[PDB]
mmCIF file of C-alpha atoms in Angstrom:
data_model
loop_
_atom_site.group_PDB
_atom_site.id
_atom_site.type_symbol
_atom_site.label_atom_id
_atom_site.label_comp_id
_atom_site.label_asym_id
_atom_site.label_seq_id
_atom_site.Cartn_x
_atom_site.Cartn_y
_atom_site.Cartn_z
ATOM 1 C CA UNK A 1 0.083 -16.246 13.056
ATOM 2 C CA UNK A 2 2.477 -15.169 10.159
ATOM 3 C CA UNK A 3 3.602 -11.996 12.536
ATOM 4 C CA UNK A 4 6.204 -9.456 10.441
ATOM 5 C CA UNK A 5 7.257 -6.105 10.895
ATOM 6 C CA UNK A 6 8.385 -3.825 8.117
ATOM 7 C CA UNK A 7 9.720 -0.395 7.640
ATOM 8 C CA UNK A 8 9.399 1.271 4.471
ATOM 9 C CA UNK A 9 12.284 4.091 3.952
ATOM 10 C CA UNK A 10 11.625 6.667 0.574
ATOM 11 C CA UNK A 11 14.017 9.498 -0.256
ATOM 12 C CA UNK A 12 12.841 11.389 -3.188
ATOM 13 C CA UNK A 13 14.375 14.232 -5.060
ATOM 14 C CA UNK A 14 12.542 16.446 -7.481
ATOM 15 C CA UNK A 15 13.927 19.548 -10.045
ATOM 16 C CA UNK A 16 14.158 23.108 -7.937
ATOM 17 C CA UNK A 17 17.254 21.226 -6.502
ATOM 18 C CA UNK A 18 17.395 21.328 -2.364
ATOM 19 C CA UNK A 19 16.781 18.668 -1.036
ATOM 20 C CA UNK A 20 15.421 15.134 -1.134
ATOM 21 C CA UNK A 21 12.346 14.836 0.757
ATOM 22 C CA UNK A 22 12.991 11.492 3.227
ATOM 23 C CA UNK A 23 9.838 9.887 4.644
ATOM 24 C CA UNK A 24 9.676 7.001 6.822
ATOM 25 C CA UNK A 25 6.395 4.423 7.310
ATOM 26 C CA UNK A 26 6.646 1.689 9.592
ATOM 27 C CA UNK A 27 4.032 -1.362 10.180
ATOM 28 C CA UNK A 28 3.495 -4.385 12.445
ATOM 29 C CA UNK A 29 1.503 -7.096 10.779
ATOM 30 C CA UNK A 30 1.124 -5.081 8.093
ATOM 31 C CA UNK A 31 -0.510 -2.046 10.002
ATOM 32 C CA UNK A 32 1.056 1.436 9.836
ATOM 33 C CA UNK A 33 2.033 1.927 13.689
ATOM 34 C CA UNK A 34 4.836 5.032 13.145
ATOM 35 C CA UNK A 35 5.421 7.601 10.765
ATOM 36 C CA UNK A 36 8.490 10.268 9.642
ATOM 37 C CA UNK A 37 8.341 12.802 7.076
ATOM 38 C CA UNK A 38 11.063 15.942 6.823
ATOM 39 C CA UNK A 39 8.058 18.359 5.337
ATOM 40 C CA UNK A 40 6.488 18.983 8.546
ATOM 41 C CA UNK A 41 7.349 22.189 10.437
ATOM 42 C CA UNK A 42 8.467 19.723 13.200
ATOM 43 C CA UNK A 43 9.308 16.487 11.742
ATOM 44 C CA UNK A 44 8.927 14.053 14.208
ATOM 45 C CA UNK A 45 8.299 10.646 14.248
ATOM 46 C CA UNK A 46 4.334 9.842 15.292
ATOM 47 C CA UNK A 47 2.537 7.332 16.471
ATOM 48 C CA UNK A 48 0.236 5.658 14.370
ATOM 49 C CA UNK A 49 -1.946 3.048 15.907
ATOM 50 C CA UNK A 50 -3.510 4.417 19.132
ATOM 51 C CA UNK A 51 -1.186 1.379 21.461
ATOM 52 C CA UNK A 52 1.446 3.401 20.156
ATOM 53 C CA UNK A 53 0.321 5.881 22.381
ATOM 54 C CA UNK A 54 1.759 3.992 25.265
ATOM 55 C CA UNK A 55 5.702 5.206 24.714
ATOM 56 C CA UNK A 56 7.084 7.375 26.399
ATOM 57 C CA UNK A 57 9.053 10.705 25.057
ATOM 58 C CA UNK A 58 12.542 9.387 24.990
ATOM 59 C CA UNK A 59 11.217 7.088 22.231
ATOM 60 C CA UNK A 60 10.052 8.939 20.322
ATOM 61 C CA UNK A 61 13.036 11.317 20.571
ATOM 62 C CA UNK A 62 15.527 8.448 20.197
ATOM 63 C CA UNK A 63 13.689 7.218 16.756
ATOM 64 C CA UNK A 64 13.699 11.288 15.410
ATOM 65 C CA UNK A 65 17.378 11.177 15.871
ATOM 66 C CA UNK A 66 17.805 7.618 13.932
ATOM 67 C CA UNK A 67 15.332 8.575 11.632
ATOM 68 C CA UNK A 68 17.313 12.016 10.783
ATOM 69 C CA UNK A 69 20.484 9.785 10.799
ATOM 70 C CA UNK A 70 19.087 8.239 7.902
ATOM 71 C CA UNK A 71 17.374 11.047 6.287
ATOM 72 C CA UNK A 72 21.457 12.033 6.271
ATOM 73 C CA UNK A 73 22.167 8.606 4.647
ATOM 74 C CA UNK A 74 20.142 8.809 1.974
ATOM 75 C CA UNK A 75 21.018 12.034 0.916
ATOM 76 C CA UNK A 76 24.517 10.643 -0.043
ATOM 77 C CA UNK A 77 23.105 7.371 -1.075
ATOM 78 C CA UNK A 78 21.263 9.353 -3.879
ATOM 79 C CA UNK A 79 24.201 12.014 -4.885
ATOM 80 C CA UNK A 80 26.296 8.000 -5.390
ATOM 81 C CA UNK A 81 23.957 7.319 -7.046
ATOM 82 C CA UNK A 82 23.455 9.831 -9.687
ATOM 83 C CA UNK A 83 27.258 9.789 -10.074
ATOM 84 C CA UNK A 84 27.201 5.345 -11.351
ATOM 85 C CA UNK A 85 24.461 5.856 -13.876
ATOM 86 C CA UNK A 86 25.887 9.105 -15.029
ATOM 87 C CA UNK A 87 22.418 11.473 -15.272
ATOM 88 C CA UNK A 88 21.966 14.756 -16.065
ATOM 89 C CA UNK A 89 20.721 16.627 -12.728
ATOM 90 C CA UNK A 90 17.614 18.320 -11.780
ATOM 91 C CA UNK A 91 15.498 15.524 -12.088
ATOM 92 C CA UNK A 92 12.886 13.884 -9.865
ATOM 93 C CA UNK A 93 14.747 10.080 -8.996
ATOM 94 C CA UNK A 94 13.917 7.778 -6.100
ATOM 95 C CA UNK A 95 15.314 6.014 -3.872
ATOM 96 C CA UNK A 96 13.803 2.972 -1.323
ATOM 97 C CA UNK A 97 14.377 0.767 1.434
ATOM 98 C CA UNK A 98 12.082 -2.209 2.526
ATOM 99 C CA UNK A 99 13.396 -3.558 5.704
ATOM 100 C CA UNK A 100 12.014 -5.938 8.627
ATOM 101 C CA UNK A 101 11.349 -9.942 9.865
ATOM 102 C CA UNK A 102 9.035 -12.750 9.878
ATOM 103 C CA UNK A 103 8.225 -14.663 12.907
ATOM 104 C CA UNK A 104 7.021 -17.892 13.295
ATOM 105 C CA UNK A 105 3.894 -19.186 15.514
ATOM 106 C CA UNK A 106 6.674 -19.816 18.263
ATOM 107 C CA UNK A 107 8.065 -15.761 17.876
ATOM 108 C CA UNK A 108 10.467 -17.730 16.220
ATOM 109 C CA UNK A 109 12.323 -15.813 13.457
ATOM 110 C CA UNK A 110 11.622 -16.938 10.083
ATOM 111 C CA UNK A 111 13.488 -14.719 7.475
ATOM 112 C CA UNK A 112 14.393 -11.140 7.433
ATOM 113 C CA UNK A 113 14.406 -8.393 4.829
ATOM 114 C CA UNK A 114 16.504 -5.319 4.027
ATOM 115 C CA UNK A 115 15.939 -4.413 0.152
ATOM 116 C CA UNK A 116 16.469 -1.479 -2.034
ATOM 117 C CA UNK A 117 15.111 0.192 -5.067
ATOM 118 C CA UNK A 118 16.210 3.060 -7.303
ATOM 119 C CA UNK A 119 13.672 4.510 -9.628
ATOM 120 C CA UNK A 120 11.674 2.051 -8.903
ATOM 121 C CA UNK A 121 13.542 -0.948 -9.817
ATOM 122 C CA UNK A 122 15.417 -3.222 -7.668
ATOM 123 C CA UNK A 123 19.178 -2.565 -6.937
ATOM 124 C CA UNK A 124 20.276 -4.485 -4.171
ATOM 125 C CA UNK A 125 18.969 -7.206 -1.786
ATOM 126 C CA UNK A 126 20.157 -8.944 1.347
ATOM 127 C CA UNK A 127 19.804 -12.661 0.612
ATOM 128 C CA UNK A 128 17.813 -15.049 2.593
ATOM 129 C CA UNK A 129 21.036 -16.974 4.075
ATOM 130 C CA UNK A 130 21.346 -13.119 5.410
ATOM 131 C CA UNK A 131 25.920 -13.127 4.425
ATOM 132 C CA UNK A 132 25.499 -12.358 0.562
ATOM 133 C CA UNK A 133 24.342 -9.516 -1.931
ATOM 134 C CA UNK A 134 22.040 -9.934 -4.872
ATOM 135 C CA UNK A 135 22.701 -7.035 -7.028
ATOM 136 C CA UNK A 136 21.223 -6.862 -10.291
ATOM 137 C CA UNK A 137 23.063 -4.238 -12.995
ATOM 138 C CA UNK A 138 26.762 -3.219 -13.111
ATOM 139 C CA UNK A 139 26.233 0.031 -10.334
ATOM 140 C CA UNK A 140 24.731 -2.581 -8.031
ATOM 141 C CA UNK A 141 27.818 -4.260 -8.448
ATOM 142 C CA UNK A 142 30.144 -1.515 -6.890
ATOM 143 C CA UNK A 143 27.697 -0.976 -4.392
ATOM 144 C CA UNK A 144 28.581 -5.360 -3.380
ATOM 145 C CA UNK A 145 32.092 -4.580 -3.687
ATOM 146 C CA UNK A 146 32.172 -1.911 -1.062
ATOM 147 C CA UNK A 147 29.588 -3.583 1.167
ATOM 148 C CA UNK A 148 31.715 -7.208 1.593
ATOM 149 C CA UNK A 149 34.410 -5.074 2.041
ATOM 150 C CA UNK A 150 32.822 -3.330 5.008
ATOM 151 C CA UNK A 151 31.184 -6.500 6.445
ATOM 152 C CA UNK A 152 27.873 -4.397 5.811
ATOM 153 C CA UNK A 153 26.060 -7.780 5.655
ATOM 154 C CA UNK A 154 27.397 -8.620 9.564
ATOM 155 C CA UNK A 155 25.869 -4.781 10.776
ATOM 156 C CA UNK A 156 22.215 -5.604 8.838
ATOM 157 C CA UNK A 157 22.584 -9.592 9.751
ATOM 158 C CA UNK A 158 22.337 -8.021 13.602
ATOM 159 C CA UNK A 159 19.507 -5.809 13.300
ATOM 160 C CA UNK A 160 17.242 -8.403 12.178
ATOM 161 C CA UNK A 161 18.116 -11.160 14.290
ATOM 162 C CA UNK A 162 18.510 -9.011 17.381
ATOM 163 C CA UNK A 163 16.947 -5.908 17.642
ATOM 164 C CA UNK A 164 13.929 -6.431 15.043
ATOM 165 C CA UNK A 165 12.832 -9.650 16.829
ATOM 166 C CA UNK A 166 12.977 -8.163 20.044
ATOM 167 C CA UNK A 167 11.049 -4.646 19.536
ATOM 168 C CA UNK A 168 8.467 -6.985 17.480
ATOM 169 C CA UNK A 169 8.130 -8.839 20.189
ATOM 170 C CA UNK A 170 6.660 -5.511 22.164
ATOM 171 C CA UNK A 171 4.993 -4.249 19.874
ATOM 172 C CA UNK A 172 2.737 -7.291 19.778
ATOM 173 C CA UNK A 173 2.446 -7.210 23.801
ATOM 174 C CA UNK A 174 1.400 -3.665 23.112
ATOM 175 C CA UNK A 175 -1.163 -4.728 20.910
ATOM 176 C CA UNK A 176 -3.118 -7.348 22.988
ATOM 177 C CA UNK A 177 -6.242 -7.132 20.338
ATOM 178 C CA UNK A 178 -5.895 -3.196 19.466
ATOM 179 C CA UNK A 179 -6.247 -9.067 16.476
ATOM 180 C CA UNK A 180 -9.669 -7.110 15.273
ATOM 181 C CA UNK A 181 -11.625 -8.390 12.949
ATOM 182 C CA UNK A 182 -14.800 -7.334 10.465
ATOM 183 C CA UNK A 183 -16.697 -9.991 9.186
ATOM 184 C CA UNK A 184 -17.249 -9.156 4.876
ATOM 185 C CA UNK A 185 -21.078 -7.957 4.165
ATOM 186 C CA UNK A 186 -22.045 -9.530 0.874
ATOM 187 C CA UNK A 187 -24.803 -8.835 -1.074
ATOM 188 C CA UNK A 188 -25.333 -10.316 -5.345
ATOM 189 C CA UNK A 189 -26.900 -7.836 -7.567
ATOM 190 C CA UNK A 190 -28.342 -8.030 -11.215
ATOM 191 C CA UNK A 191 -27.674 -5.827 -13.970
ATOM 192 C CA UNK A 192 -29.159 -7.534 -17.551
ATOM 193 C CA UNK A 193 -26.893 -7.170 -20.737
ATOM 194 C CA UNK A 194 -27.856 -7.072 -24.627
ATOM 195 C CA UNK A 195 -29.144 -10.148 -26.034
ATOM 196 C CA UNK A 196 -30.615 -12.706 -23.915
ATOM 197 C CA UNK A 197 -28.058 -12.212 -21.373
ATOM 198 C CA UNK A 198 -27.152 -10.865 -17.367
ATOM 199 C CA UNK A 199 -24.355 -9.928 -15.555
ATOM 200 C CA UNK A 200 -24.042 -11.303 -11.602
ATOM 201 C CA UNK A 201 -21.889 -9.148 -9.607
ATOM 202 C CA UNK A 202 -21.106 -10.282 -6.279
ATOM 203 C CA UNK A 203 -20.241 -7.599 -3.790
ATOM 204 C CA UNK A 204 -18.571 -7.715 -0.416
ATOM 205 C CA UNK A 205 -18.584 -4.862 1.652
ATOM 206 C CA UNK A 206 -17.098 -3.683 5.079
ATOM 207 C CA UNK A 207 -14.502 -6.448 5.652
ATOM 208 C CA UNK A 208 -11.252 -6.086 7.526
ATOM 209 C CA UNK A 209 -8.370 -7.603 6.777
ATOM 210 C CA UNK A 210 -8.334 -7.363 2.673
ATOM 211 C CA UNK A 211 -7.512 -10.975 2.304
ATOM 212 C CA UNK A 212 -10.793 -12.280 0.888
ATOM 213 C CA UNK A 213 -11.274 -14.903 -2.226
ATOM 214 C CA UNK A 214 -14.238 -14.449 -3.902
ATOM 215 C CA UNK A 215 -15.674 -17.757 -6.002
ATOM 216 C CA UNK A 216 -19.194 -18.027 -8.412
ATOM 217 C CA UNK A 217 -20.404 -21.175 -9.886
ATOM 218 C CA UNK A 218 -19.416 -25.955 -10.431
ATOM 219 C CA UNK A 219 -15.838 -24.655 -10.118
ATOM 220 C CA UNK A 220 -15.828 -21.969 -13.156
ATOM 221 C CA UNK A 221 -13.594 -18.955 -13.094
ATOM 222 C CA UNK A 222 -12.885 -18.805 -16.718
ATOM 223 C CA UNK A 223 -14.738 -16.148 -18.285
ATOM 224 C CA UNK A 224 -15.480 -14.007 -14.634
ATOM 225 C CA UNK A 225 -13.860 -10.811 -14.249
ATOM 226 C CA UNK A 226 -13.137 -9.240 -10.868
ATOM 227 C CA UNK A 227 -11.453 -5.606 -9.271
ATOM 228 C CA UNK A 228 -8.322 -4.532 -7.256
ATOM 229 C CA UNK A 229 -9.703 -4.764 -3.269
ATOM 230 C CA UNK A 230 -10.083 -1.229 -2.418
ATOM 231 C CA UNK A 231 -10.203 0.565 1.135
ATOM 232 C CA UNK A 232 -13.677 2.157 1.855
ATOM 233 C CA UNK A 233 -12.115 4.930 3.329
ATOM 234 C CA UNK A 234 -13.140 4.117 7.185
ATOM 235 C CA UNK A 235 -10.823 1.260 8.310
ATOM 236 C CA UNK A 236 -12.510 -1.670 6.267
ATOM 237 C CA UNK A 237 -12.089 -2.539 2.732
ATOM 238 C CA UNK A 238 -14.400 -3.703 -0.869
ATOM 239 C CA UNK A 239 -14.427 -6.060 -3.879
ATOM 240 C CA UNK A 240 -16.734 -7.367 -6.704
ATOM 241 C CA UNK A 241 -16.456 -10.266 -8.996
ATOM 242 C CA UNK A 242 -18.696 -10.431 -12.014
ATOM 243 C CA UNK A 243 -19.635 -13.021 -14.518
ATOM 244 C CA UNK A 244 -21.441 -13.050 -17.981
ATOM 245 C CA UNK A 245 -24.500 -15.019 -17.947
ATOM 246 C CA UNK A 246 -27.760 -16.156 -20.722
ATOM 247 C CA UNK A 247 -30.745 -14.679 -19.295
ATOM 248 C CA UNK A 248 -33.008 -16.339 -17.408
ATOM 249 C CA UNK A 249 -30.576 -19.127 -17.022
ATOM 250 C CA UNK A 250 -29.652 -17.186 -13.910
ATOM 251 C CA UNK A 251 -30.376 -19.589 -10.956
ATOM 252 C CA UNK A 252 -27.619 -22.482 -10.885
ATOM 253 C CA UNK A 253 -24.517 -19.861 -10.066
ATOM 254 C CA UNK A 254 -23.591 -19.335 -6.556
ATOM 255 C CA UNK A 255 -21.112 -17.158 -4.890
ATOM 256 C CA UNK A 256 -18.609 -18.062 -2.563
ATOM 257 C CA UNK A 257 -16.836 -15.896 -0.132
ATOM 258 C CA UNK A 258 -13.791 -17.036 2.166
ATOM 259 C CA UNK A 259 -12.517 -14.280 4.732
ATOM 260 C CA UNK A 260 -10.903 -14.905 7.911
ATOM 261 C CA UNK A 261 -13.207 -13.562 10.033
ATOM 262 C CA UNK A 262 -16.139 -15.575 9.271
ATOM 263 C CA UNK A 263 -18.005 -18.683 10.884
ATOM 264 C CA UNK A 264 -18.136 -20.829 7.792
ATOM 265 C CA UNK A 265 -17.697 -20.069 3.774
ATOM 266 C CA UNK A 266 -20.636 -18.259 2.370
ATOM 267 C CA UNK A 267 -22.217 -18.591 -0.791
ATOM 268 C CA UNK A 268 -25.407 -16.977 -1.764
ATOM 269 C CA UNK A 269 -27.298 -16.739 -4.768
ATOM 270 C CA UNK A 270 -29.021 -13.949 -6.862
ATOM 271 C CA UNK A 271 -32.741 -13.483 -5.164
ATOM 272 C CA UNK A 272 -34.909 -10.855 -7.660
ATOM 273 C CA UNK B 1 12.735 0.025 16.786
ATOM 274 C CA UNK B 2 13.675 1.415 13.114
ATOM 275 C CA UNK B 3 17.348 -0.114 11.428
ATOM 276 C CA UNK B 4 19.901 2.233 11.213
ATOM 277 C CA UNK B 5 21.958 1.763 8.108
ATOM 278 C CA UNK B 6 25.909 1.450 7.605
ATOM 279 C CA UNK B 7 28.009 2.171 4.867
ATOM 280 C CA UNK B 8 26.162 4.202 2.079
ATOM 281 C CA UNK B 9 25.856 3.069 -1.458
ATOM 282 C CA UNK C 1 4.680 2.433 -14.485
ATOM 283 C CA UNK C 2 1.141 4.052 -15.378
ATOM 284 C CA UNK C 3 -1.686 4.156 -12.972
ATOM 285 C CA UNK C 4 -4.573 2.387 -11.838
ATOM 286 C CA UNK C 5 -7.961 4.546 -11.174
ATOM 287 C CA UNK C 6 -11.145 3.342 -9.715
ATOM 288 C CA UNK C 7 -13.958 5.750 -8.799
ATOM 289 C CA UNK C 8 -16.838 3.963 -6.080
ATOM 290 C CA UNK C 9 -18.321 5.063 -2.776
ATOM 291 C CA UNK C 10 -18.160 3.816 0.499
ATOM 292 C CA UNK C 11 -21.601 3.006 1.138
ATOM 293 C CA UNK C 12 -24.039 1.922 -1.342
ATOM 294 C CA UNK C 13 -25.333 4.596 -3.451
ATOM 295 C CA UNK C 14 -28.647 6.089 -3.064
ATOM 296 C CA UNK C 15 -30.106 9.491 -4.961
ATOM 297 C CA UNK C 16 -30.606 12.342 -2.583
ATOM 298 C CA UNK C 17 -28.604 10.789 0.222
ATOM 299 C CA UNK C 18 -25.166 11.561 1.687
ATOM 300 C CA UNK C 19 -22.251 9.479 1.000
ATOM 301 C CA UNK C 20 -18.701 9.716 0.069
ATOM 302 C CA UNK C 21 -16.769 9.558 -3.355
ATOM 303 C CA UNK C 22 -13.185 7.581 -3.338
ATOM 304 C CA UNK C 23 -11.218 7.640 -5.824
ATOM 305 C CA UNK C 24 -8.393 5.412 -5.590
ATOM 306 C CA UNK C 25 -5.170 5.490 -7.391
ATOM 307 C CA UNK C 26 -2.335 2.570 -7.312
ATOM 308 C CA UNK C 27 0.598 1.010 -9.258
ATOM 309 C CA UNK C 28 2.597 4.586 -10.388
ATOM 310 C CA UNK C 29 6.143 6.093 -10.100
ATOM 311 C CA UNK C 30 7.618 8.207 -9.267
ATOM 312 C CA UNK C 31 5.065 8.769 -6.226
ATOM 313 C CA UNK C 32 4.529 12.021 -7.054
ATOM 314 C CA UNK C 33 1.299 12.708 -8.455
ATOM 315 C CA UNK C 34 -2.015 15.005 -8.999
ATOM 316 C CA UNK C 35 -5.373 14.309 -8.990
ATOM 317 C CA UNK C 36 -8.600 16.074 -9.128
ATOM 318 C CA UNK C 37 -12.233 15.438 -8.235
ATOM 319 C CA UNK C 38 -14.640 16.520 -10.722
ATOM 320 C CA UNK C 39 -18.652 17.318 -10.412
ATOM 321 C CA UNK C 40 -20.039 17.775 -13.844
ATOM 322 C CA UNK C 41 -16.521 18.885 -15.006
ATOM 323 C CA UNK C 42 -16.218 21.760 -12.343
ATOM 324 C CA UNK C 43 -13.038 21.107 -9.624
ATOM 325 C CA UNK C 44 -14.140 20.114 -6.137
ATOM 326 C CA UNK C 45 -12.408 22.415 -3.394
ATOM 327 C CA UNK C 46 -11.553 20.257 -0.623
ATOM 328 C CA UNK C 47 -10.692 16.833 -1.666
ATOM 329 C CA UNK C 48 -9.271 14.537 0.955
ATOM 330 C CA UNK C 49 -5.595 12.825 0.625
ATOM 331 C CA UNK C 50 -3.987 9.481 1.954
ATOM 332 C CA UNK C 51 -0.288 10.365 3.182
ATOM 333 C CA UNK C 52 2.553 8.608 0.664
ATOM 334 C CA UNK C 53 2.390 5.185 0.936
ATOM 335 C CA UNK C 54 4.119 2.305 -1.243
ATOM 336 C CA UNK C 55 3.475 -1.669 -1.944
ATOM 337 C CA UNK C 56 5.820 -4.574 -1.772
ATOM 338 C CA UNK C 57 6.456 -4.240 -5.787
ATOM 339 C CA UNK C 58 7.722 -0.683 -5.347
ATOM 340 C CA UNK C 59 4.817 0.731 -6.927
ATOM 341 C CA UNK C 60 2.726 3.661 -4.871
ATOM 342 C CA UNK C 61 -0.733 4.102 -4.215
ATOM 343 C CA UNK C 62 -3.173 7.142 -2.933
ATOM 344 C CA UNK C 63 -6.497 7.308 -1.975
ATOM 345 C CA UNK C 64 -8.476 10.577 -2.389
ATOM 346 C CA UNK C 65 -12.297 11.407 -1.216
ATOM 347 C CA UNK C 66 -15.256 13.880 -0.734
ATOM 348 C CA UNK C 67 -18.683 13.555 0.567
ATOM 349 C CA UNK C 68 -20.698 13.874 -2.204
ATOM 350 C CA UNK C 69 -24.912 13.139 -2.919
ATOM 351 C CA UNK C 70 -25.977 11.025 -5.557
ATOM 352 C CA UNK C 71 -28.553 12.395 -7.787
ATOM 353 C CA UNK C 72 -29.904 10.890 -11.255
ATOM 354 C CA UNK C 73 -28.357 13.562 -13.536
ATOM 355 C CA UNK C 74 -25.057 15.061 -11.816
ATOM 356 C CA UNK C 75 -21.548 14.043 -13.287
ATOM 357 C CA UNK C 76 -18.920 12.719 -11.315
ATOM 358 C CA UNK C 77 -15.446 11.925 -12.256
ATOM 359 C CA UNK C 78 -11.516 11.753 -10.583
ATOM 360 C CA UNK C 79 -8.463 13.117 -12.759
ATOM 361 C CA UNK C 80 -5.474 11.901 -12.282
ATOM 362 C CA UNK C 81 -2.164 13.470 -14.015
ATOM 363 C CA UNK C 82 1.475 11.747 -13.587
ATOM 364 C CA UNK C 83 4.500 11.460 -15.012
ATOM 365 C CA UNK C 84 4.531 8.108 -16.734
ATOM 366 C CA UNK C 85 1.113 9.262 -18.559
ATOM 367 C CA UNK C 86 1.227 11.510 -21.931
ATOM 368 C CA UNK C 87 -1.720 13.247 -21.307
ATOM 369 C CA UNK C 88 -3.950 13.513 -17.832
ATOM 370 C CA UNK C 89 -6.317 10.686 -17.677
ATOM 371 C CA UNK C 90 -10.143 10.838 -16.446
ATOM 372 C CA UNK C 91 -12.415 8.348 -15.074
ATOM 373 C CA UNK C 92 -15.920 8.526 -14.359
ATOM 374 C CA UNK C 93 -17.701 7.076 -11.637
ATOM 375 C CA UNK C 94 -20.464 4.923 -12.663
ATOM 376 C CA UNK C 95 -22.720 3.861 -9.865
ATOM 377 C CA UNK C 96 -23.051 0.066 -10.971
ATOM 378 C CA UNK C 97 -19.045 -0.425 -10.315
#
């Protein structure tokens, strides 16, 4: 499948001064497998995703040191920062990296990523031909000036085509299945509305991965309403989708669920 | 493995 | 960017019977935020917290939760209070959503 691996860097700095707070998530196939954070009494980072488990010290020793290298790096990357757009201090401000890979059905790599993000808007990306900066606003400019300067885009360029793809790689081996699946639960429900009318909500319940399309009707999505997929709080995930309806004109509408995990599409009807 | 970044911004 | 609340529970709800409130926060920054469980206006002590975690636009998202018991009459609401929001916000959990 569409196998990636990400790691999402945030450095954030709040009033009461100090210092930033750096916290580090990483995920394989879009599953948190590692964590950092410099609050703990022994910041470390920790496994996430029980074949994780399977590393020995020196690993995760080697990735608290890089880790700390970088809580280091943002630190500065900040102070620059606060110097281009001239702010007045003791303020919160962020600061974020997305970085990682895409591999192909062959573990062949497909793109790679290394973004960034200051209060929450983008400031400077890595381009897909992986040799040239995309920097939107003038302080994203200095940043590109500095960075072809210092062949930054050669050092990043190596990460994801070597290292990334190749620790990916184990991570997968790692996890064999640990590819799991949960089939979606799906029930329709009916909860009348003022004058002559119904509402059909169609639930789905317990399903794992999130991806999940949820269709009622033929071929009508117009006036339906649906709600953000949510986590149940256990490992597996929810979703709804409703649609207004005249009462007692209730039978012609079906609902039709597509998840990964299941046999076949399934579509099922309101039964009173 | 995590990346390890270079020159700062 | 403001917030996004949703207030449901894991399993579906029955009166009298155990089960577990989530209320689920998304799309805000700066990531740090607050947010309170509420049982007929009165604080919950113990709420549980999803560690810091952000989505592919930038934005950040929490989840908080409590076991709980639905009954016909109690109250239950989440309030949430960050930076990008005037005033704290309050949404309350209605068992048909």
């Amino acid at each position: 499948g569409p196998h990636s691996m990400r790691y999402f860097e945030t450095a954030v700095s709040r009033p009461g001064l100090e210092e930033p707070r750096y916290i580090s998530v990483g995920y394989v196939d879009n599953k948190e497998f590692v964590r950092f954070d410099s609050d703990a009494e022994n910041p470390r980072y920790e496994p996430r995703a029980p074949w994780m488990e399977q590393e020995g010290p020196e690993y995760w020793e080697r990735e608290t040191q890089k880790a700390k290298g970088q809580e280091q790096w943002f630190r500065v990357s900040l102070r620059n920062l606060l110097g281009y757009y001239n702010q007045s201090a003791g303020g919160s401000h962020t600061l974020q990296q997305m970085s990682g890979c895409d591999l192909g059905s062959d573990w062949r790599l497909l793109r790679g990523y290394l973004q960034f993000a200051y209060e929450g808007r983008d400031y400077i990306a890595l381009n897909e031909d992986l040799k040239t900066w995309t920097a939107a606003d003038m302080a994203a400019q200095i940043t590109r000036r500095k960075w072809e300067q210092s062949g930054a885009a050669e050092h990043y360029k190596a990460f994801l085509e070597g290292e990334c793809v190749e620790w990916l790689h184990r991570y997968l081996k790692n996890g064999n299945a640990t590819l799991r699946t949960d089939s979606p639960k799906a029930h329709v429900t009916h909860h009348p509305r003022s004058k002559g009318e119904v509402t059909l909500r169609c639930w789905a319940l317990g399903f794992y991965p999130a991806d999940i399309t949820l269709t009622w009707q033929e071929e009508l999505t117009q006036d339906m309403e649906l709600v953000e997929t949510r986590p149940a709080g256990d490992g597996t995930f929810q979703k709804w989708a409703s649609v207004v309806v005249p009462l007692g004109k209730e039978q012609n509408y079906t609902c039709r669920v597509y998840h990964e995990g299941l046999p076949e599409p399934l579509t099922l009807r309101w039964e009173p | 493995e995590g990346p390890r970044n270079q020159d700062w911004l | 960017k403001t917030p996004q609340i949703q207030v449901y529970s894991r399993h579906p709800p029955e009166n009298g019977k155990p089960n577990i409130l989530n209320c689920y926060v998304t799309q805000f920054h700066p990531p740090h935020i607050e947010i309170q469980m509420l049982k007929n206006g009165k604080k919950i002590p113990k709420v549980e917290m999803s560690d810091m975690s952000f989505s592919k636009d930038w934005s950040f998202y929490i989840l908080a939760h409590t076991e709980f018991t639905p009954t016909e009459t109690d109250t239950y609401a989440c309030r949430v209070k960050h930076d990008s929001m005037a005033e704290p916000k309050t949404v309350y959990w209605d068992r048909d959503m």
